[PDB]
Structure formats: structure tokens, C-alpha cells
Amino acid sequence: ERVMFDKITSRIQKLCYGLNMDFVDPAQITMKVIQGLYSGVTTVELDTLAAETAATLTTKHPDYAILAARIAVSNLHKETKKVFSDVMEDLYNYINPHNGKHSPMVAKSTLDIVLANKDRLNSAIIYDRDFSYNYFGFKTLERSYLLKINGKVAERPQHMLMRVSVGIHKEDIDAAIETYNLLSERWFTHASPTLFNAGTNRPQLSSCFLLSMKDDSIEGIYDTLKQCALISKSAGGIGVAVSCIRATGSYIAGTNGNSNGLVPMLRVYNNTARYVDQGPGAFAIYLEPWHLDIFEFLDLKKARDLFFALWIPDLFMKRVETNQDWSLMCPNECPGLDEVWGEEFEKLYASYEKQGRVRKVVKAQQLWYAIIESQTETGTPYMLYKDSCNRKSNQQNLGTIKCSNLCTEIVEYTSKDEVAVCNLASLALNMYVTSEHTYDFKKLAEVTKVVVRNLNKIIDINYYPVPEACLSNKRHRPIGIGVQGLADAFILMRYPFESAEAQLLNKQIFETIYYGALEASCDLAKEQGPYETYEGSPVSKGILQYDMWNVTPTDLWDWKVLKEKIAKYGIRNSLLIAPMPTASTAQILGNNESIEPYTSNIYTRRVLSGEFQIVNPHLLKDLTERGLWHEEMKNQIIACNGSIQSIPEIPDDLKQLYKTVWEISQKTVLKMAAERGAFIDQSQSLNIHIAEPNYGKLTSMHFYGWKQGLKTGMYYLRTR
Numbered sequence: 001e002r003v004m005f006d007k008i009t010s011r012i013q014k015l016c017y018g019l020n021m022d023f024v025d026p027a028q029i030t031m032k033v034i035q036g037l038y039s040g041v042t043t044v045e046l047d048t049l050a051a052e053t054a055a056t057l058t059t060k061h062p063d064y065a066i067l068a069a070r071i072a073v074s075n076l077h078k079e080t081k082k083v084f085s086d087v088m089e090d091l092y093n094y095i096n097p098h099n100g101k102h103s104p105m106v107a108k109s110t111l112d113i114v115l116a117n118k119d120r121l122n123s124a125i126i127y128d129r130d131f132s133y134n135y136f137g138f139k140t141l142e143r144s145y146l147l148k149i150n151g152k153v154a155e156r157p158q159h160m161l162m163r164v165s166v167g168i169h170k171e172d173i174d175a176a177i178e179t180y181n182l183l184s185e186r187w188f189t190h191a192s193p194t195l196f197n198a199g200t201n202r203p204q205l206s207s208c209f210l211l212s213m214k215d216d217s218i219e220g221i222y223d224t225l226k227q228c229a230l231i232s233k234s235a236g237g238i239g240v241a242v243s244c245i246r247a248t249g250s251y252i253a254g255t256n257g258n259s260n261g262l263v264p265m266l267r268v269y270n271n272t273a274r275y276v277d278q279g280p281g282a283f284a285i286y287l288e289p290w291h292l293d294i295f296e297f298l299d300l301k302k303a304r305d306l307f308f309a310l311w312i313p314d315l316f317m318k319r320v321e322t323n324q325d326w327s328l329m330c331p332n333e334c335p336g337l338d339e340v341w342g343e344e345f346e347k348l349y350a351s352y353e354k355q356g357r358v359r360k361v362v363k364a365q366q367l368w369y370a371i372i373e374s375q376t377e378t379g380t381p382y383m384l385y386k387d388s389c390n391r392k393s394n395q396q397n398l399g400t401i402k403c404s405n406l407c408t409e410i411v412e413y414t415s416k417d418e419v420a421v422c423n424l425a426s427l428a429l430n431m432y433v434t435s436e437h438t439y440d441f442k443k444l445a446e447v448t449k450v451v452v453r454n455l456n457k458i459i460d461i462n463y464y465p466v467p468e469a470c471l472s473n474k475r476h477r478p479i480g481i482g483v484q485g486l487a488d489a490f491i492l493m494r495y496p497f498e499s500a501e502a503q504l505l506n507k508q509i510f511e512t513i514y515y516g517a518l519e520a521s522c523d524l525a526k527e528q529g530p531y532e533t534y535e536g537s538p539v540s541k542g543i544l545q546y547d548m549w550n551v552t553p554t555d556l557w558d559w560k561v562l563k564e565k566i567a568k569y570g571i572r573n574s575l576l577i578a579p580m581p582t583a584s585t586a587q588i589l590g591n592n593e594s595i596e597p598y599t600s601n602i603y604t605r606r607v608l609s610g611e612f613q614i615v616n617p618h619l620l621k622d623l624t625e626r627g628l629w630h631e632e633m634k635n636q637i638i639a640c641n642g643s644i645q646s647i648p649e650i651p652d653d654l655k656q657l658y659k660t661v662w663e664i665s666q667k668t669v670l671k672m673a674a675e676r677g678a679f680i681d682q683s684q685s686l687n688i689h690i691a692e693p694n695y696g697k698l699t700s701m702h703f704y705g706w707k708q709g710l711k712t713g714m715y716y717l718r719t720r
């Protein structure tokens, strides 16, 4: 009797294994999916209509997103070949059908390793792991990370991961399989470039590059510009130290004229970033605040493809705080201020002052408030503390570090002959919480060892866009291991972000990563010898990052014994740790970004023409299981900008747990950054969230960060 309303309900019901059926209701999906109408429709339109329908119910319970993903994945599975070696073969044999030209999508060398070991590699893969993404993390993979033939996905998520593994580990099949298992289980992820390009020809595997301007001359300026344009060709973020370029109106000997300053120079850099965007290039431009063009620099963005950062010496900060004057200089009149830091900077700068080699004197506080006025409008410039960066860098023996990278986590040496490179991965901190609410530190360490070994192998396979990058990387072998899902780990342990329980876990997590990392880096040194510039470095003198912060680790790990291992063998890598923003990879694994708390408990994702409302999944489980969740409450939470603090019916323990970043003290945020920072040998990407900007309050956040010892005081300022 008409009927046939279940039928499709059963198809949906089939993929609900393990979901919370108190809130997931297949019939609800079918009521919208039916309206399926059509005589000419089949088993392909629903699956995509049911997946979309399930995904909009993510606001009723999080398992709807898991159901949406299973529907979408099983659908992808039937439009895809199962066998890995066969997808790689088709990727290689791709003839671009309308230019005629053979255009292989994987490297011949990769495919040949694959075909030579297909039985082991094909059978190592477990396709049910493709079902472990939530809908939105799957659609991100589908959009950018799975190779397409015809505009039709050929790679399963498993196929992509296995390519990446073989791409990294080559003929080492044991390694490749181990890394496959870690990645497919989600214990860590490689950074986006690695996922895109490993196993391909053109394996541009790195994330960001750092440059110093070659010299203060048209010649110099345009070599650097070229270098930037070549790097931009290959998935490059860029940081550029620009302080050695002479100021506006300074004398040019050879044309008897006057320099045009930084601004019109940077117009060229800005247009090169717009122009070379693979076909959206972004350069971060780093200036020291003594440079005479500082005011015009802080007023420009008010240059859309440039991002601005101050490389700040302690002296400037002391001058601001004691209300003294601040001398602005042209680097051509006063050379080498950017080649030197700390005492040696303060003395040389002071000496130019005593000589009256000064182009303008301002009150330090006039410049200070130009800076924070800039930050209020654009949220830039980024605030980096030059002297902290150098004082606590294991690359010290190389010389003064002139800048950081696009996202402020990388503090590495650069020069005329060297472009610094960021080789990146992240650990998924939430995955290490046991089902018994304890933190598995030993597994964390063991995973970090694997990441180190992979990042070292990447240094050696990478396609470098300029030879100065290659030289840099091979000489010092730095690596940047970050994290994601710290907020999620806290919540899974039931710790409020500001609680003493989290503050200790926070310190222990990062003791552990630095420990494992050093341990693998030392094991690699035993096998292959220390990196070339290791003799001289603070680590070669028995000094580790925490010693530079005058911090004593907790009792969790035996540092005495590691130091003996390092004293004997050295380490393979000049630097190891750098919590980066993880914007794209966090969105794939379904964690919150990096070290950041949840910015809001309700947020939207776009998926093509779709717009989806998502509730903090930890929160939504808590609210649903306490019979508190309904639509009228969702709308109250939206009306309070994602806060649950003024909703009377939520118990105060959950309110503590689900504070948004706006409601968490930024002083605490900056403090925990300094505390884990003692075990981070580079820096960390650290935004400040102040609800409504207040010049006094911002000045006070900056000085707190500076005094805590942070290398990066502030990435972006966010106001809402």
C-alpha cells in the first residue's frame, strides 16, 4: 500500500553501527531524502542527498556527521578501484586527453617501488579506516587531497596516505607500512604540502621559507624578489627580513638622488604575491622598530598580500615602559643593527645615538601606540621578540636570526646564501587520552620518534625551489613538530583549560614531545652523525631549551640520561619543535587547531554550496546525555556568540569546561605558552583574543608576553 518509506531507512540504518540511537534517527533523514521524487533517479542521488541531510542534523547530535561520512565514503568506495597499486598505475599512465601529452600524476620511481611490492602494500591497507573521518573532514580531503582523473576522485583516503608513506620512505617497506598505520589511525598528520606532493614528481614537501634581503641595492632587492617568486611557485608561505633597506629620502651615491623607502618597494613584493599564486601567495614582511620607515609601515595595511611583523628588541620595550625617547635610523647611515642582538645590539645602537647618527627622535610611547592602533584595525603586525628568539635558539652559533615565518612558529637562521625551510608535521594530542582518563605519555613519545625520522627523510627527498633553501636545510636539518587538539585533550580529560590539572598536563605533554624528539634526533645522529653546524651549538655544550628558560622539568622523564646520550652522539637536527597553526589538517582530523582553546561552541562549515551549523561535539554529547539539548537552546548559544555561560540550566562543571577563548584569561593563555615554551626550541603561533580592544589592556598583554620570555608575543589579534 504505497509505503516504501523504510526501505531507504534500512540503507541508512545499515551504517549506524555504534552510533547513539537515542538521538540518531534514520527515519528523520528519510523524510527529507524521500521528496526524492523522480522516475529517472537511482542509487547515487540519495546517497548524496542522505549524506547532506544527515550532515545538517549534526546540530542534533555529532554521530549524524559520522553517519553522513559513512554514507559519503561508501558511495566514494563504489566509484573507486579498491586495489592501491592499480590506482597508482592509473595515476601514472594518465594521458591529459586534450593536450595529448603524457602527464603522470605520480612519480615513476614511486610507482616502481609500489609495483615491486604490491602484494605487501596492497594488503597492508585497511579501507574501513576511510570511515573514520567525519563528513566535513572527509569533504576537505575530497576537495583537495585526493588525486583526480577526469574531475573524478581516483584516490581513496587510504590510497593517498599510502602514497604519502611510500613517497617518504621509498624502498623501506617496513617504515612505509608503520607510517601508513600511524597516519590512517590518526595519531599524527604530515603538513598539507607533504600530503599533496609526496610520491609525485615535483615533491615540494615543505610549508614555509624564510629569507633575508640579499643587500641594500636594486640588484640585491631584485635577486630577493626573484627568489620569492620562484618559491611562491611551490606551495610556499614566505617570511622576509626587510630592515636592511634604506629609509625614505636617504642618499643614493650612484644616481645623486634619494631612496623611495620601503613602501613603493613593498608594492612590488605585494604584486608579485598576487601574481605568483600557483594560478594565493602571502609574504610576511618583518621590520625592526628602529627603522626610520616604521610609522609608514604600521599605516600601510590600514598591501593586501603582505602580512606585517615587528622583529622587536628588548631595548624598544624597555624604552616604552620607562617613558624614554626612541631613535629612528636609516640602516645605511647606521649599519649592522639587524646583524646583532641583545647586549651587542643595545651597545651598537646606543653608540650610533651618542654619535648623533639619528634621523628622527620620537617618544618610545608615540611609536608604541602607533603599533597597538595598527593591531586594533588589522590585527597586525605580529609581535616577535628578537632578543628572546636569538637568546634561546640552538642555531645561535650561526649568527643573528633576522626574522620568522608567515605564521610566527619558525625561528631559523637566514642569510644571502641560505633560505630557511620549514619541514612540518603535527601530533593529535586527543588521541593519547586513555578510555580511563589518563594521558598516554609513552605512546606520545614513541609517535614523536617516528615523526622525527620521517621529517629527516623529507629533508633529504624534498624538491627545493632555489638552491639556497637546499643548502640551508642540509647544513642544519631543522624540523618543526607541532600539535593539534590540545583543547580536545583537556576536554577528554575533563579539565577546564585554565585549571591546574590542565596547566600540568600542558607542561607534561610538551616535556614528552621534546623528549622523544631529542631521543630520535640523537638516535639518528648515532646512525649518521650530527648535522654539519652542530659543533658550537648550545645543545653541543649540554644546554637544552628549558635550560635557556631557566626551568626545571617535572619528574616525568629522565633528562640526565638523555643528556648523556646527547653528549656522546649529538643530534641530527638543529631544531625540532614548533607548534604551527594547523588550519587545514585540524579540519581533516576533526580536532581544534593547535594550542588554541575552542573559539566558540557553535560554528559553521561551508562545503561547496552547503552551510552547516556545528556544536562543539564534546559539549553536544554532554548536553544530549543530560536531556538538556533542544533547538531553543542552540539559538540562545548563538545569541551569546557561542557561549554557554549565561544559560542557567547548564551545570557549572560543564560551564568551566566549555569556556570559549574569549572567556579564558589571555594572561593564562600567554602563561601556559611560556610554560610549554621552555620545551619548544622554535616558537609557537599564538593569537590573542580580546573581546573588545582596549589600548591599555593590549599594552598590558604585550608586556606580560614579553616578560614571560615568549619568542612570539602575538600572531594575530582577534576582537569580535
Ligand SMILES: Cc1cn([C@H]2C[C@H](O)[C@@H](COP(=O)(O)OP(=O)(O)OP(=O)(O)O)O2)c(=O)[nH]c1=O
Pocket (backbone or CB within 6 Å): 216, 217, 218, 219, 245, 246, 251, 252, 253, 254, 255, 258, 259, 260, 261
Ligand atoms: C636606484 C634606486 C635606488 N633606490 C634605493 C633602493 C636601495 O635600497 C638603495 C640603493 O640602491 P643602489 O642600486 O645600491 O644605488 P647605488 O648603486 O647608487 O648604491 P649606493 O648608493 O649604495 O652607493 O636605494 C630607490 O629607491 N630608487 C632607485 O631608483
Ligand SMILES: [Mg+2]
Pocket (backbone or CB within 6 Å): 216, 217
Ligand atoms: Mg649600491
